[PDB]
Amino acid sequence: SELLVNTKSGKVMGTRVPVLSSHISAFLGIPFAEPPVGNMRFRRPEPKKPWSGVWNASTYPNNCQQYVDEQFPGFSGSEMWNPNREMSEDCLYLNIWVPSPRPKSTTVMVWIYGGGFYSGSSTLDVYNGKYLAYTEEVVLVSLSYRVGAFGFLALHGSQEAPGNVGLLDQRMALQWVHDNIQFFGGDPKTVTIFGESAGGASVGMHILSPGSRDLFRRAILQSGSPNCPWASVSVAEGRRRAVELGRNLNCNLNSDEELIHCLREKKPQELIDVEWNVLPFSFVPVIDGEFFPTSLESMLNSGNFKKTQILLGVNKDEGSFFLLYGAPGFSKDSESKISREDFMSGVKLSVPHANDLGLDAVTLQYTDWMDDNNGIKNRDGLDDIVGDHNVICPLMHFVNKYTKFGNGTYLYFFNHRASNLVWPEWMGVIHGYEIEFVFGLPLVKELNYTAEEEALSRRIMHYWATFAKTGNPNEPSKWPLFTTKEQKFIDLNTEPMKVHQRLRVQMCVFWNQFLPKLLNAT
Amino acid sequence: SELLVNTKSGKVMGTRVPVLSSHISAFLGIPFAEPPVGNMRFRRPEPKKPWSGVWNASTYPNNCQQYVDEQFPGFSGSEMWNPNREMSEDCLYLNIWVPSPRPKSTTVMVWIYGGGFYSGSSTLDVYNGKYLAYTEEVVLVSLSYRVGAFGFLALHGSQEAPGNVGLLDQRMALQWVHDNIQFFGGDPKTVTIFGESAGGASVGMHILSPGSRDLFRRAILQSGSPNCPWASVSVAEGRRRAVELGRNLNCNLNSDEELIHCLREKKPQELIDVEWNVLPFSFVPVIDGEFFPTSLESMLNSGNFKKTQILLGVNKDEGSFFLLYGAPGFSKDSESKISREDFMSGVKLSVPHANDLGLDAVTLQYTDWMDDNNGIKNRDGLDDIVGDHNVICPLMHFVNKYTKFGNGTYLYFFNHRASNLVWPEWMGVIHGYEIEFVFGLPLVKELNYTAEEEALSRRIMHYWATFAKTGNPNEPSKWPLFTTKEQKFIDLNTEPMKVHQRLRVQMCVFWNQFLPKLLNAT
Numbered sequence A, B: 001s002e003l004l005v006n007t008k009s010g011k012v013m014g015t016r017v018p019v020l021s022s023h024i025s026a027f028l029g030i031p032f033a034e035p036p037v038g039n040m041r042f043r044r045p046e047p048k049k050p051w052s053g054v055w056n057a058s059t060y061p062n063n064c065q066q067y068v069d070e071q072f073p074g075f076s077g078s079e080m081w082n083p084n085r086e087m088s089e090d091c092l093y094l095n096i097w098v099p100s101p102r103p104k105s106t107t108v109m110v111w112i113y114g115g116g117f118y119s120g121s122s123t124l125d126v127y128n129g130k131y132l133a134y135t136e137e138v139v140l141v142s143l144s145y146r147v148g149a150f151g152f153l154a155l156h157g158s159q160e161a162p163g164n165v166g167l168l169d170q171r172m173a174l175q176w177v178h179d180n181i182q183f184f185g186g187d188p189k190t191v192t193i194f195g196e197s198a199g200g201a202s203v204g205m206h207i208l209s210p211g212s213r214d215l216f217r218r219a220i221l222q223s224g225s226p227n228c229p230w231a232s233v234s235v236a237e238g239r240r241r242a243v244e245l246g247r248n249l250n251c252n253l254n255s256d257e258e259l260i261h262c263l264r265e266k267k268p269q270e271l272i273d274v275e276w277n278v279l280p281f282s283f284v285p286v287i288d289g290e291f292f293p294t295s296l297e298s299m300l301n302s303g304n305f306k307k308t309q310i311l312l313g314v315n316k317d318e319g320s321f322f323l324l325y326g327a328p329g330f331s332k333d334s335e336s337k338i339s340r341e342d343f344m345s346g347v348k349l350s351v352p353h354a355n356d357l358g359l360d361a362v363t364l365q366y367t368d369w370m371d372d373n374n375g376i377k378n379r380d381g382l383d384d385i386v387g388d389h390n391v392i393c394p395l396m397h398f399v400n401k402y403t404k405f406g407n408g409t410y411l412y413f414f415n416h417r418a419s420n421l422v423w424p425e426w427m428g429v430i431h432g433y434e435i436e437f438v439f440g441l442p443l444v445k446e447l448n449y450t451a452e453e454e455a456l457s458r459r460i461m462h463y464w465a466t467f468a469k470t471g472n473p474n475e476p477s478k479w480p481l482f483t484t485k486e487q488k489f490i491d492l493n494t495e496p497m498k499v500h501q502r503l504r505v506q507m508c509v510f511w512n513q514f515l516p517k518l519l520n521a522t
């Protein structure tokens, strides 16, 4: 049987699913770790103990515990990111889509979902892996990992809540793939890990961390990189927030044991309800000196990281999503013209760690002084501030550092605004919306994309799959390599390829070189 | 006799001169102070003691002792600024052009030459006042003042070398106009002081100084304002440089009297020969508490200054002249493309007072990062850096502070490049070159200007004279008033008058608000 597979942990029974009038093999909700419940919560995961019998793998597993977005109840644009399954701390499962018939030893791609390290699910409609596995003949895998406090509460020194366990969770699913993907037709020596946003930061963290390097071949980073300002914190800040979570829940704060034991008796929603109350994203990776030996910046300067090929990029409007959720004067229904009063508080809010001088620098850098009370210019400038600071420049800093040592870099700028996008037009090319093209949703007619969006999705997948199989997106019209001298990249849209150079250099020299120097002195 | 005039200090005999096939009276070399020689060097001017007989006022007087430029020996573009008469410490004289026949009580304009407070003469071909006195029916006066150590050596406390004596010479000449101009056909109640560069900074200093305010009605400032970074120093810096001048000349430094007496024994050229050796322009006005009661900034915020009408502005390329003379990579016979190494060192030199953070700031603010090695963009950026930091932005700050309390502001941007310029094209519309137009040299045919330049000149002159007589450059195509709201100004060129707003706001916010704050905090 094509559906019954035997693995080092037990037998598994997948199901047959239809894909664009053909079919493929799917193994859903396969366990890769021991449920991190009870005294396990907050701890490094442990491998799933082998089972007897046949594991039913014809359905999606639970989604990890996480804050659930209710800003726009029932709206499909927000709702598509929320758990579409029941939440549970018993959530460490992976999904595999295998082409039918089973390939001898084909290319594997492991998907790592985003959600700011506080949310996310492997089971979203946008991460349905059948179209990619099917269309490109790849074995497609989506893992899961604990988010929020459950995955990142960090009490450095403690072994009961060491920090970075959602990351170790990711590493264990990768190890599982390394150990078992072969029984599915996948080639363990050819695995590409790829993710978007918090997941893209994840990929880059596994490129860094010595203990993950050998568990994959190549990496793809979408709108996220390891060095993002919101992707990690110091052991100090991690400890401080862990204690503050305790304080908020009436926990004896005498010792880490005291604290941790209190947190372990609390029901899930109880941690989730107070999660936001500890900020100066609450629980994120910690630069511990273990998963990450030294500072991210020093590892990058020394070349202390996996040297391989990478494919990465950003979307045109990385910041509009967050402006709509956290800044004054933005609305899902209005054009969102921003007055100068709002613009100003909007920058105070986008560079949370900056002083007055720093704020003046940002302000002056994104204000047209001939037309300072223009609402569109202020809206769009705040969008760029958020996107440049949080996603784009940190990524360009990483792309430049890595290329000095890597074995091949491919950079992209995705600027296509889907024709069926349910979000307001002023939001442009939104953070997260290149994903539906990566996963081939445009190939399904009921979804109503245009003929060119299908064409766009098809070359995006073929670039991705080809890159996964060979280290180069092109089969022997060319996407050029990104070199520290030339710095080329392509646009990704329906129109014909255009090669450009130095993606957002001006603004990124400001964020990467200049602003940090300014905050240092002051 | 029309040429024989009797004044409060003695009879004076002028001469009839030709002007565009006609004639007018000229009274050249009239003494307004006692020769500041011997024990008088560095002291405040003393009024000229009355004489008997008739003073011969038919020729130009001596030029004050100053550094002479011979970077381009024989070259007309640099020599037109050098002394065209013998140099002597006996140089406190003034010149008057009176329309023929003699007006009953017409508008008076007093020219104050520039030259960075270390040079300048009233007798230059470009300041010939006959064309303007003639064409606009005004009585035109050019005064003189001591420059270099002779006029600005400051040892505050001392009364032998109090500093600011060159400003007081200007004030003595203004006082003399007040008391005598009526006998020449001039209206002492309708005098406009006007000058360029250091002379424009001078006019502004007389607007601030309580003791000069009543000696004129209105003011015109061309390419300079009181608050320019190179236009004044503190008493400490003044003293520091005074002592350092003595040191280079082996002087007793035990006390000011010892020093001054030594400084008074050295011949003129000896002081000049070591004038530059004291810079961390050497001797300029001092914020002494007397000529200027408080800081220039505090006087401008409190409105502690003469309230009247002002007409002022800048040229398109204020900085090319100083780049030709002091920066690496510039030449008069080359297109002067600037390497990246030279651009760097060039900003270091342009903003002498800034730390490394300030320098990075300036560099970033003026570098196109997608074409940083373009030689021409580097030349032009350095040009704008010098021009914006030393002339334009200081002036815009002045303009905005003054309009808050003034009684009428008329702003201009002169961007016409003379058809007959002997300086290279890359230098554009140079510092000082709008003067030939203000003085009507485009009206003399052998000078080989075009006819739309003769026309430009005529309207500039008419605007200047009309403004001098009424406080408005337009006789009832209009030059709008500059208001703190609309911030309107006009271009001054051969094409039809265009009205713009916010002259170089973008860069000026950087120079006037952001960089000062950056530096104050670091």
Ligand SMILES: COc1ccc2c3c1O[C@H]1C[C@@H](O)C=C[C@@]31CCN(C)C2
Pocket: A069, A081, A113, A114, A115, A116, A120, A196, A197, A198, A431, A432
């Ligand atoms: C910085 O990354 C994020 C922080 C918060 C959120 C998202 C993020 O990435 C977005 C797109 C996708 O990665 C998943 C979640 C996001 C969209 C859904 N919500 C509600 C919140």
Ligand SMILES: COc1ccc2c3c1O[C@H]1C[C@@H](O)C=C[C@@]31CCN(C)C2
Pocket: B069, B081, B113, B114, B115, B116, B120, B196, B197, B198, B431, B432
């Ligand atoms: C900042 O002002 C100046 C500093 C130095 C010089 C000049 C300045 O203004 C220029 C134009 C005019 O005002 C007189 C002298 C200048 C041109 C001639 N030389 C050689 C030097």
Ligand SMILES: *[C@@H]1O[C@H](CO)[C@@H](O)[C@H](O)[C@H]1NC(C)=O
Pocket: A056, A057, A058, A059
């Ligand atoms: C696996 O569980 C699903 C959920 O109800 C069910 O549809 C399927 O038949 C099960 N497989 C078997 C035969 O156990």
Ligand SMILES: *[C@@H]1O[C@H](CO)[C@@H](O)[C@H](O)[C@H]1NC(C)=O
Pocket: A406, A407, A408, A409, A481
């Ligand atoms: C990748 O590595 C091989 C040697 O291991 C090298 O020859 C090749 O040039 C590298 N490719 C790139 C694009 O750096």
Ligand SMILES: *[C@@H]1O[C@H](CO)[C@@H](O)[C@H](O)[C@H]1NC(C)=O
Pocket: B056, B058, B059
């Ligand atoms: C005035 O001085 C000039 C120049 O020295 C001389 O030529 C002229 O004749 C003098 N006029 C009188 C009347 O002294």
Ligand SMILES: *[C@@H]1O[C@H](CO)[C@@H](O)[C@H](O)[C@H]1NC(C)=O
Pocket: B406, B407, B408
């Ligand atoms: C100048 O001041 C007078 C008051 O003395 C006032 O009537 C006039 O409107 C003012 N003009 C301007 C342009 O400020």
